[PDB]
Structure formats: structure tokens, C-alpha cells
Amino acid sequence: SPEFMVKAKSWTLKKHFQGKPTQSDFELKTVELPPLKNGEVLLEALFLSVDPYMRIASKRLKEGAVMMGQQVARVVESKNSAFPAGSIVLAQSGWTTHFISDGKGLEKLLTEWPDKLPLSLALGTIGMPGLTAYFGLLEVCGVKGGETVLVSAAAGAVGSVVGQIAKLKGCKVVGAAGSDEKIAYLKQIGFDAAFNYKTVNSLEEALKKASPDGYDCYFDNVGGEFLNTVLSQMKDFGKIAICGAISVYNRMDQLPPGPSPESIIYKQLRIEGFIVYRWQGDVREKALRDLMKWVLEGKIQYHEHVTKGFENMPAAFIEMLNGANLGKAVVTA
Amino acid sequence: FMVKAKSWTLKKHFQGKPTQSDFELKTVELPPLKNGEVLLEALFLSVDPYMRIASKRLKEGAVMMGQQVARVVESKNSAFPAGSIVLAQSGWTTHFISDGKGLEKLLTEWPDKLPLSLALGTIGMPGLTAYFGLLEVCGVKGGETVLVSAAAGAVGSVVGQIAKLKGCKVVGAAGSDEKIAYLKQIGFDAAFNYKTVNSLEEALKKASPDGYDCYFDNVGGEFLNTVLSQMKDFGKIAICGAISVYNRMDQLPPGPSPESIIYKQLRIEGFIVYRWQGDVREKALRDLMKWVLEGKIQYHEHVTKGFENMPAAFIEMLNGANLGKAVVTA
Ligand SMILES: NC(=O)c1ccc[n+]([C@@H]2O[C@H](COP(=O)([O-])OP(=O)(O)OC[C@H]3O[C@@H](n4cnc5c(N)ncnc54)[C@H](OP(=O)(O)O)[C@@H]3O)[C@@H](O)[C@H]2O)c1
Ligand SMILES: NC(=O)c1ccc[n+]([C@@H]2O[C@H](COP(=O)([O-])OP(=O)(O)OC[C@H]3O[C@@H](n4cnc5c(N)ncnc54)[C@H](OP(=O)(O)O)[C@@H]3O)[C@@H](O)[C@H]2O)c1
């Protein structure tokens, strides 16, 4: 009978990002939640995700609106039989602690989820980033064993999966990340070679040294100048999966010099962009089951860069874009 | 009577746009033929955009590279008797001594009504580039909207006409009103002058409101960057050339947006004519021949008379003075 008020906190974009995002660009907001109506559910954020795409997608956002994003939530109260109280769900509810949903965009967590795996993996390795890697590598690059794969942002959420899936499929893998720590971690999880792109004497020589015969596929997470240099190291008919271009997210208006036509043409390279969401239904579930299975078998190792506290979400996003994160950046409620 | 051959050599590596001073004429009396050799006399010499890039590899003083239609004057090789017409990668020279190894004979049933110089264009390398770039790389099946840059050029003109005969909608871009009028007359559904149009995006949008299935890229650079936003989802981009940056290869303009390539999930693919060989290549040439004879593929040659005017013809073509294939008559 007693009714208790639910305070929902949200992170809103105060001012659009000029260059690198700063704390001042965000403003905490609090809103009192109305009671649930028939066919509605009240969600309580457990784990929130911060992702690179937010830096770009934030532009289409109206200043004052809530930042976009996916989160793992728990159903506190329910008046929707499909989502019973206590059930776990994935929601594109944005940066908010609590949220009322009619059940539309809600996605039930993979059934048979092991207690030993933290639920936050549903936002990374056994989630969107892991699916991005799975498809961009196996579908776009289309590796079938033996190929040499280069992956930028190798110690990131997507890159970490790419490299390990490439290894379990019999490919030689070269990874590039931003710290000596990430490089050491890459060697530990199975990368054949890895170098710190920030301290390299010569990017061309490093890539050459890592694979003198070149690369069959380059999973591009960085774009920009790094991409331009890689082209010269690609084998004839080599594929380039354009997954992201994080190096230019803060300078989309003033993009750096482009890729050389000479390399693209004479080496007859194939460059292809893609988005995770292209793969739906049965193939997507299959991919999730495989990632789950590979994690349990120890094939795909993982690490989460956990930031505790909803109030520290802007910092977690900013630092993730700056490279402080080893593995998936996740913010615990 | 001895033969004195003249050759155009690279005096100095091009700095931006090539000029006349970058070329030097050299004359040398050729030695007698040795067994298995032939003496060639250039008839038609080609000047091509790739020469602007390939010249960088040359050791200053070397003869400029290129293909030419030549006749056998003297012969000591049974495979090539005097009187034969051949295609040779002999470079910019009036006379050349070959051992017969690289010489390619023209299509066996060459029609008299068609000038031999077409063997260097529409029914040649550029024509093959158009054929394979459009049919294999863009891989059109019919009904698609195709965009072609340098539309009134050797490659571009063939792309547009093969696309049309295959049942596609063709949009072409060129740099002169004379070329735009020519493109309309030969079949292009739409054609705009990229130099005068107020907005490149608007011109592309008006030509095809629904977007583009395939973009045959002969220009690259800033032009390419703009096309991307107009490509339909999953659209194909055949990177054939990038003449727009040949004079600034070391100082490349801003690259394509990752946003367009990623969200539209575009496929960009470079290619070189040379990938296609053997029976598939010979069949393509016959198809080109048949289409020209049937009138489906009209052509125009931008002829420059005289060997000493070859540098000028090369420079001109890079600047866009040519409508159709640029060819030099010896
Ligand atoms: N198409 C799709 O469907 C799709 C889906 C998800 C993600 N993506 C893209 O995939 C890429 C990886 O995303 P993620 O979720 O896995 O993030 P993440 O890699 O975990 O985090 C981003 C990482 O990027 C690196 N970075 C930042 N600035 C850089 C710069 N200037 N140059 C080079 N590296 C830089 C940092 O690591 P270092 O210390 O190594 O620099 C940072 O940790 C991003 O570009 C993202 O947009 C695409
Ligand atoms: N991959 C391959 O195998 C292969 C083989 C042959 C040729 N190609 C390439 O195909 C393209 C066309 O070659 P082609 O022999 O047919 O030459 P072409 O088009 O007959 O002559 C080049 C034409 O390019 C245009 N142009 C020059 N500078 C330009 C600029 N800054 N911006 C836009 N257009 C410019 C000019 O026409 P406008 O009046 O329209 O400006 C010029 O007439 C070249 O890029 C060439 O490198 C590739």
C-alpha cells in the first residue's frame, strides 16, 4: 500500500563538445518519476556503458537533452508480463539511474547467463562491441585462417575481441595500442605482436617488422594518419574493415590528409565500412552464443575498466576517449 | 640509309604541374638489328594520366614511358615481318628496336573504317579499364544509377556508354560546357560542369535525387569526398584513378569522412586494367569493337600532330584540354 518516490538522475549535454569533451559539457539533472501505468516497467540501472560513438552522435542531440547510451538494468516494478520484476534487461535508456519503459526497445539478456560472468559483459565482449568485432572480422574481413590481421585500438573493447577471435581462427595478429601496459596485456592474451603507436620510431617500420609479407586484413578502429600508413603495408587485394575512426572524432570538421590513391589502386585494396546492427535475428544470436562459449572456454579473455558511480559517468567517457581504459569502459551505478 | 630515332626524356621530375622545360628531346642513330629483333616506327603515341605518377620512378634523363601503335620497318624475327602493326610499350620514341617479347598484335579483324589509334583508347587499355571497372568492380546488372567523373575523357566516355547499353541511369561530370553538351548528345541522362556549378552537392542531388548505386572514380580528391554523402546504402565505389591529386601526391587534401563510409556501409575498391588477362581480356576487346561498330559506343580522339608536340599533348590532357582520348600522330 505505501508509495515511495523514485528519484531518477540523468546526465544531460549542457554544451556541445569543442575538441575534447570536458566535465562542463555535462549537467546532472534529477526528475521525480510518475507511477507505472498498465504495460509499463520501472528500471534501475546496474551497469552503464560509455562508447566512442557518443562523441559523434552527441552532435545530433539538442543541448539539454539526456546523453545517449545502452545500459544493463533490473526491473524493480512491473505491470508488463513479458518483463517480470527482478528480470535483467538491456536498454537504450541513456545516461540515467532509473527509467520507465513500456517494453519497446528492451532486450532480454542472453538466456542461460552464467552466475560467474558479471552482467556488464552484456555491454562489451558478450555485447555490441564483441558483435562488432565478430562480424567485422569474420564477415567484412572474412578471415578463414592463415591470414595476418592488423587491429588498431587493440586493447580496447572491440580490438581485444578482434585479436582473440583472429587467433582462435588460426590467424597471425598484430595489434596497436596507446600504452606499454596495453602492449604487455596484448602479448599476454595471445597477440603475435603489438606495439605502442605513440612511442614508435617509425610506424611504417614497426608495421613492416611485425609482418614483412604484409597484411591480408586491417580492422580499422582509428582511421586518420594511422590508416594512411597501413595502406602501404597491405597485401594485394587486401581488405580493410572500416569499423571506426576515433583519431578524428574531435576534429571531424578539419580532417587530416587522406589515403594515398597509389596504394589503393595498384594494390587493388578493398575498403569497407560497416555497423553492428546490420546483423540481426538468428545470425546475431548465434554470434552472441559463440562469444559466450568462447569466453567460457577461455578462448576470449576479458578485462573491464570499471568506473564506480553514476555521478562519475562523464569522467569515464572522457577518459575512455583519452585512452585510460584497458578493455570495456563500464560505469557501475 | 641509317635511321635516327628521337626520344622525349624526363629532364627533371615534375613539381606540381609539368611544364615544357621538364622534357628534353634526344636524337641517336640506331645500330643495326641483331637476330630476333625488329625495328619499329611509331604511328600513334599515347599520352596518359598515369605517366604523371609513374614518372617519379624514372631516373632523370630516361625516356618517358608509354604505349604506341607502331609498324615494323625492318625485321629479323619471324613472328613480326616487315609491314606488321603492333602495340608496343616502347615509350616516347619515333623509332624502337625490340626483341619481340613485349609486342602485342592488334585484334585480328581490325576494320579499316576504324583508325588504328583506337587501339590505344576505346578499343584499348582505357576502354578495357572502363569495361572491367564498370562491369566487374561496380558490377552493374541493369537499373542502377551510375556516376562517372572525367565523363568526357577516354575512360569516362566508355563507362557512360557501356552503362547506358546495360540499362543503367548515367550521370557524368566534366570541366567544360563543350564536354557537357557532348555527353548529353552521346546518351548520358544527366551531366554537369563541376567547375561552374554553384554547389557540387546540389548538382549531384539534382542529377539523381535518390542517390548513386556506383561511382566510377577517375578524379578522387575533394570531388570524391562529396560524392560519398550522395551514395545509397551499400553503394560501390570503383577507385579507377585520382587525377585530382596527381600534381599533389605528397600534399594530399582532407580525406573522406568515416561517417559516410561507416553509416552508409560503403565499399570502396581500387583496380588496375591489368588484372584481367587471357580469354576474358580478348573477349572484352571484341565486345568493345562490336559496340563501336554497332554505334552503341561513340568515340572522339583529341589528336595532336607531330612527335615534337608530345610533351604539350601530355600537359594539355592533364589540364583537361582533351575531349576523348589524347593521341599523338608521329
Ligand atoms: N561500426 C560499428 O558498428 C562500431 C561499433 C562499436 C564501435 N565502433 C568503433 O570501434 C572503435 C573501438 O570502440 P570501442 O568501444 O572498442 O572503444 P575502446 O577502443 O574501448 O576505447 C576507445 C580507445 O580508442 C583509443 N584512442 C583514443 N584516441 C585515439 C587516437 N587519437 N588515436 C588512436 N587511438 C585512440 C584509446 O586507446 P589507446 O590507448 O590504444 O589509444 C581508447 O581506449 C571506435 O572507433 C568505435 O567508434 C564501431
Ligand atoms: N586503374 C587503371 O587501370 C586505370 C587505367 C587507365 C586510367 N586510369 C585513370 O582513369 C582516369 C581517366 O584516364 P583517361 O586516360 O581516361 O584520361 P582522360 O579522362 O582522357 O584525361 C584526364 C582528364 O581528367 C580531367 N582532370 C584533370 N585534372 C582534373 C582535376 N583536378 N579535377 C577533375 N578532373 C580533372 C580532365 O578532364 P575535365 O575537363 O573533365 O577536367 C582531363 O581531360 C585517370 O585518373 C587515370 O589515371 C586508371
Tab-separated table of C-alpha atoms in Angstrom, chain A residues 13-288:
chain	number	residue	atom	x	y	z
A	13	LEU	CA	24.612	17.544	-22.551
A	14	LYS	CA	24.931	21.144	-21.367
A	15	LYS	CA	27.177	22.317	-24.226
A	16	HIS	CA	28.275	20.612	-27.449
A	17	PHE	CA	31.839	19.289	-27.495
A	18	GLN	CA	34.560	21.549	-28.941
A	19	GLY	CA	37.603	19.342	-29.403
A	20	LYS	CA	37.892	17.073	-26.341
A	21	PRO	CA	34.756	16.751	-24.140
A	22	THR	CA	35.014	18.394	-20.692
A	23	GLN	CA	33.064	17.995	-17.439
A	24	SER	CA	31.440	21.407	-18.013
A	25	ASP	CA	29.786	19.932	-21.120
A	26	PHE	CA	27.616	17.798	-18.827
A	27	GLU	CA	24.947	18.683	-16.269
A	28	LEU	CA	23.361	16.361	-13.700
A	29	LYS	CA	19.563	16.536	-13.673
A	30	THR	CA	17.004	14.998	-11.311
A	31	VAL	CA	13.377	14.156	-12.114
A	32	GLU	CA	10.661	12.660	-9.922
A	33	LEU	CA	9.191	9.557	-11.554
A	34	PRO	CA	5.426	9.143	-12.134
A	35	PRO	CA	3.679	5.890	-11.120
A	36	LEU	CA	3.672	2.957	-13.543
A	37	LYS	CA	0.699	2.567	-15.864
A	38	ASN	CA	-0.514	-0.783	-17.234
A	39	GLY	CA	2.006	-2.265	-19.639
A	40	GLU	CA	4.955	-0.372	-18.110
A	41	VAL	CA	8.092	-1.296	-16.162
A	42	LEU	CA	10.389	0.656	-13.827
A	43	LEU	CA	14.092	0.036	-14.473
A	44	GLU	CA	17.078	0.537	-12.160
A	45	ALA	CA	20.456	0.904	-13.874
A	46	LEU	CA	23.042	-1.626	-12.726
A	47	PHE	CA	25.775	-1.096	-15.333
A	48	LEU	CA	26.037	1.757	-17.817
A	49	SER	CA	28.155	1.896	-20.952
A	50	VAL	CA	30.215	4.778	-22.332
A	51	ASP	CA	31.166	4.468	-26.021
A	52	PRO	CA	33.194	6.376	-28.661
A	53	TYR	CA	30.157	6.831	-30.940
A	54	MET	CA	28.678	9.107	-28.252
A	55	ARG	CA	31.278	11.748	-29.170
A	56	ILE	CA	29.754	11.969	-32.660
A	57	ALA	CA	26.113	11.078	-32.029
A	58	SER	CA	26.051	13.865	-29.412
A	59	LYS	CA	26.039	16.414	-32.248
A	60	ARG	CA	22.533	15.477	-33.407
A	61	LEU	CA	21.497	15.974	-29.770
A	62	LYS	CA	19.648	19.086	-28.618
A	63	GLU	CA	21.580	20.785	-25.801
A	64	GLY	CA	19.832	19.998	-22.539
A	65	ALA	CA	18.736	16.526	-23.663
A	66	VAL	CA	19.901	13.317	-21.959
A	67	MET	CA	23.095	11.684	-23.317
A	68	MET	CA	22.502	8.549	-25.429
A	69	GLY	CA	23.682	5.091	-24.409
A	70	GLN	CA	22.947	1.471	-23.549
A	71	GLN	CA	22.772	0.002	-20.052
A	72	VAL	CA	22.131	-3.221	-18.169
A	73	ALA	CA	19.142	-2.649	-15.879
A	74	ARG	CA	16.948	-4.508	-13.398
A	75	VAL	CA	13.154	-4.418	-13.369
A	76	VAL	CA	12.195	-3.042	-9.943
A	77	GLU	CA	8.423	-2.867	-10.500
A	78	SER	CA	6.411	-4.324	-13.356
A	79	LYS	CA	2.981	-4.153	-14.921
A	80	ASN	CA	4.191	-5.854	-18.110
A	81	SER	CA	4.007	-9.665	-18.051
A	82	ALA	CA	6.888	-10.022	-20.536
A	83	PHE	CA	9.296	-8.258	-18.141
A	84	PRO	CA	8.695	-9.613	-14.590
A	85	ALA	CA	10.096	-7.759	-11.578
A	86	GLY	CA	13.653	-8.900	-10.922
A	87	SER	CA	14.431	-9.720	-14.560
A	88	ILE	CA	17.550	-8.236	-16.188
A	89	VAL	CA	17.349	-6.206	-19.402
A	90	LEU	CA	19.476	-4.176	-21.835
A	91	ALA	CA	18.154	-0.715	-22.633
A	92	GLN	CA	19.000	2.294	-24.774
A	93	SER	CA	17.655	4.461	-21.937
A	94	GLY	CA	20.706	6.701	-21.967
A	95	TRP	CA	22.646	8.079	-19.019
A	96	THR	CA	20.057	7.668	-16.268
A	97	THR	CA	19.762	5.758	-12.965
A	98	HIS	CA	16.063	4.832	-13.322
A	99	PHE	CA	13.716	4.725	-16.308
A	100	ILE	CA	10.100	3.886	-17.110
A	101	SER	CA	9.663	1.753	-20.220
A	102	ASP	CA	6.624	0.338	-21.975
A	103	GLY	CA	8.846	-2.540	-23.115
A	104	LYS	CA	9.650	-1.406	-26.673
A	105	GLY	CA	13.419	-1.121	-27.082
A	106	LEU	CA	14.155	-3.521	-24.201
A	107	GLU	CA	16.285	-6.575	-24.967
A	108	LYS	CA	16.266	-9.610	-22.686
A	109	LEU	CA	19.711	-10.727	-21.542
A	110	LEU	CA	21.073	-13.922	-23.137
A	111	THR	CA	19.212	-16.842	-21.562
A	112	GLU	CA	21.322	-19.311	-19.541
A	113	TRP	CA	23.622	-16.500	-18.379
A	114	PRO	CA	26.314	-17.925	-16.040
A	115	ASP	CA	26.468	-16.566	-12.491
A	116	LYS	CA	30.291	-16.478	-12.814
A	117	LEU	CA	30.135	-13.870	-15.577
A	118	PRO	CA	29.417	-10.294	-14.477
A	119	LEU	CA	26.309	-8.855	-16.164
A	120	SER	CA	28.354	-5.945	-17.546
A	121	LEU	CA	29.843	-8.236	-20.221
A	122	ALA	CA	26.481	-7.873	-21.978
A	123	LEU	CA	27.652	-4.326	-22.808
A	124	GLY	CA	31.068	-5.358	-24.114
A	125	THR	CA	32.586	-8.733	-25.010
A	126	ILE	CA	29.238	-10.525	-24.998
A	127	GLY	CA	27.512	-7.430	-26.309
A	128	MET	CA	27.602	-4.771	-29.015
A	129	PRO	CA	31.411	-4.289	-29.097
A	130	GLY	CA	32.004	-8.045	-29.197
A	131	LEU	CA	29.485	-8.371	-32.035
A	132	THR	CA	31.185	-5.535	-33.930
A	133	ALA	CA	34.481	-7.416	-33.748
A	134	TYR	CA	32.916	-10.781	-34.593
A	135	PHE	CA	31.220	-9.514	-37.747
A	136	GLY	CA	33.792	-7.027	-38.988
A	137	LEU	CA	36.443	-9.723	-38.720
A	138	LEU	CA	34.582	-12.858	-39.834
A	139	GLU	CA	32.199	-11.177	-42.312
A	140	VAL	CA	33.813	-7.959	-43.567
A	141	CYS	CA	37.463	-9.079	-43.452
A	142	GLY	CA	36.212	-12.622	-43.986
A	143	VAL	CA	39.221	-14.351	-42.429
A	144	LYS	CA	39.380	-18.138	-42.833
A	145	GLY	CA	42.689	-18.970	-41.167
A	146	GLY	CA	46.295	-18.227	-42.038
A	147	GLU	CA	45.768	-14.525	-42.816
A	148	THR	CA	47.683	-11.789	-40.995
A	149	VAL	CA	45.371	-9.348	-39.227
A	150	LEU	CA	46.236	-5.829	-38.025
A	151	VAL	CA	43.915	-4.268	-35.433
A	152	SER	CA	44.161	-0.709	-34.162
A	153	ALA	CA	42.986	0.227	-30.628
A	154	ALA	CA	43.962	-3.388	-29.909
A	155	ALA	CA	43.456	-3.160	-26.129
A	156	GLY	CA	40.015	-1.583	-26.461
A	157	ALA	CA	36.639	-3.307	-26.198
A	158	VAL	CA	36.310	-4.150	-29.896
A	159	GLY	CA	40.003	-4.573	-30.626
A	160	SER	CA	40.510	-7.050	-27.767
A	161	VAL	CA	37.845	-9.330	-29.198
A	162	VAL	CA	39.061	-8.975	-32.817
A	163	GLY	CA	42.572	-10.097	-31.938
A	164	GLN	CA	41.440	-13.081	-29.873
A	165	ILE	CA	38.861	-14.222	-32.416
A	166	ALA	CA	41.524	-13.904	-35.116
A	167	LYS	CA	43.818	-16.107	-33.027
A	168	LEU	CA	41.188	-18.802	-32.333
A	169	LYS	CA	40.543	-18.940	-36.101
A	170	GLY	CA	44.229	-19.512	-36.900
A	171	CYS	CA	45.299	-16.029	-37.991
A	172	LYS	CA	48.540	-14.195	-37.203
A	173	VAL	CA	47.647	-10.993	-35.309
A	174	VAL	CA	49.378	-7.626	-34.946
A	175	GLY	CA	47.927	-5.110	-32.519
A	176	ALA	CA	48.481	-1.439	-31.805
A	177	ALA	CA	47.535	0.405	-28.606
A	178	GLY	CA	48.442	3.546	-26.642
A	179	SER	CA	50.460	2.317	-23.639
A	180	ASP	CA	53.265	-0.045	-22.609
A	181	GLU	CA	50.743	-1.651	-20.224
A	182	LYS	CA	48.257	-2.348	-23.034
A	183	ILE	CA	51.081	-3.763	-25.166
A	184	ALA	CA	52.078	-6.175	-22.380
A	185	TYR	CA	48.438	-7.178	-21.918
A	186	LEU	CA	48.154	-7.849	-25.660
A	187	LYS	CA	51.158	-10.193	-25.575
A	188	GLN	CA	49.538	-11.969	-22.596
A	189	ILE	CA	46.216	-12.681	-24.341
A	190	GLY	CA	47.882	-14.095	-27.441
A	191	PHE	CA	48.795	-11.304	-29.856
A	192	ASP	CA	51.748	-12.340	-32.032
A	193	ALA	CA	52.991	-8.766	-31.982
A	194	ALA	CA	51.943	-5.451	-30.531
A	195	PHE	CA	53.454	-2.008	-30.425
A	196	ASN	CA	52.713	1.286	-28.718
A	197	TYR	CA	51.789	3.554	-31.660
A	198	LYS	CA	52.561	6.635	-29.565
A	199	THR	CA	56.231	5.826	-28.920
A	200	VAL	CA	57.063	4.195	-32.270
A	201	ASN	CA	60.217	5.462	-34.023
A	202	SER	CA	58.641	4.709	-37.406
A	203	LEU	CA	55.072	3.469	-37.850
A	204	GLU	CA	55.983	2.079	-41.284
A	205	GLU	CA	58.992	0.177	-39.924
A	206	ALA	CA	57.015	-1.134	-36.933
A	207	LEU	CA	54.270	-2.468	-39.202
A	208	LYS	CA	56.931	-3.851	-41.565
A	209	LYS	CA	58.770	-5.570	-38.694
A	210	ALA	CA	55.511	-7.043	-37.374
A	211	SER	CA	54.739	-8.601	-40.784
A	212	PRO	CA	57.206	-8.321	-43.734
A	213	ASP	CA	54.789	-10.111	-46.089
A	214	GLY	CA	52.122	-7.525	-45.248
A	215	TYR	CA	48.528	-7.695	-44.050
A	216	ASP	CA	45.549	-9.563	-45.517
A	217	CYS	CA	43.156	-7.565	-43.390
A	218	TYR	CA	43.227	-4.397	-41.321
A	219	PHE	CA	40.414	-3.940	-38.811
A	220	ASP	CA	40.361	-0.136	-38.673
A	221	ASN	CA	39.270	1.397	-35.365
A	222	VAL	CA	41.402	4.550	-35.564
A	223	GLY	CA	41.310	5.917	-39.116
A	224	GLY	CA	43.243	9.102	-39.801
A	225	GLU	CA	47.034	9.071	-40.195
A	226	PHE	CA	47.465	5.512	-38.920
A	227	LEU	CA	45.146	4.231	-41.672
A	228	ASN	CA	47.101	6.145	-44.337
A	229	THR	CA	50.335	4.452	-43.260
A	230	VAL	CA	48.827	0.966	-43.105
A	231	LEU	CA	47.734	1.097	-46.768
A	232	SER	CA	51.369	0.808	-47.881
A	233	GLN	CA	51.663	-2.421	-45.859
A	234	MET	CA	48.546	-4.135	-47.191
A	235	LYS	CA	48.920	-7.158	-49.463
A	236	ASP	CA	47.420	-7.009	-52.959
A	237	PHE	CA	43.621	-7.392	-52.837
A	238	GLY	CA	43.860	-6.822	-49.078
A	239	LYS	CA	40.726	-5.925	-47.148
A	240	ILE	CA	40.224	-3.011	-44.746
A	241	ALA	CA	37.259	-3.167	-42.401
A	242	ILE	CA	36.371	0.438	-41.576
A	243	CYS	CA	34.851	-0.016	-38.116
A	244	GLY	CA	35.661	3.364	-36.588
A	245	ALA	CA	37.940	6.412	-36.804
A	246	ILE	CA	38.438	7.509	-33.212
A	247	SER	CA	41.508	9.633	-34.057
A	248	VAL	CA	39.299	12.151	-35.937
A	249	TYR	CA	36.236	12.259	-33.642
A	250	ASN	CA	37.410	15.547	-32.080
A	251	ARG	CA	38.326	17.039	-35.476
A	252	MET	CA	35.513	15.982	-37.838
A	253	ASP	CA	35.449	19.482	-39.354
A	254	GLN	CA	39.186	19.610	-40.099
A	255	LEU	CA	40.058	16.092	-41.278
A	256	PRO	CA	43.769	15.193	-41.883
A	257	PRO	CA	45.300	14.381	-45.304
A	258	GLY	CA	43.559	11.395	-46.863
A	259	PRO	CA	44.654	7.909	-48.009
A	260	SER	CA	47.002	7.581	-50.977
A	261	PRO	CA	45.263	6.656	-54.253
A	262	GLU	CA	48.512	4.996	-55.358
A	263	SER	CA	48.280	2.266	-52.714
A	264	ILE	CA	44.527	1.720	-53.074
A	265	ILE	CA	44.762	1.408	-56.863
A	266	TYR	CA	47.990	-0.515	-57.523
A	267	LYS	CA	47.376	-2.876	-54.592
A	268	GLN	CA	43.683	-3.164	-55.539
A	269	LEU	CA	42.615	-2.804	-51.919
A	270	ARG	CA	39.032	-3.244	-50.751
A	271	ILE	CA	37.894	-0.765	-48.106
A	272	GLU	CA	34.526	-1.395	-46.417
A	273	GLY	CA	32.610	0.408	-43.693
A	274	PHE	CA	30.057	-1.378	-41.503
A	275	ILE	CA	27.749	-1.109	-38.488
A	276	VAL	CA	26.984	-3.907	-35.985
A	277	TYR	CA	23.251	-3.529	-36.417
A	278	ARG	CA	23.444	-4.904	-39.987
A	279	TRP	CA	23.366	-8.374	-38.442
A	280	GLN	CA	20.047	-9.301	-36.828
A	281	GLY	CA	17.933	-12.314	-35.901
A	282	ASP	CA	19.391	-15.824	-35.894
A	283	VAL	CA	22.897	-14.833	-37.013
A	284	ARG	CA	23.148	-12.273	-34.219
A	285	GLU	CA	22.031	-14.721	-31.536
A	286	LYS	CA	24.476	-17.265	-32.959
A	287	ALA	CA	27.251	-14.669	-32.671
A	288	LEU	CA	26.328	-13.963	-29.028
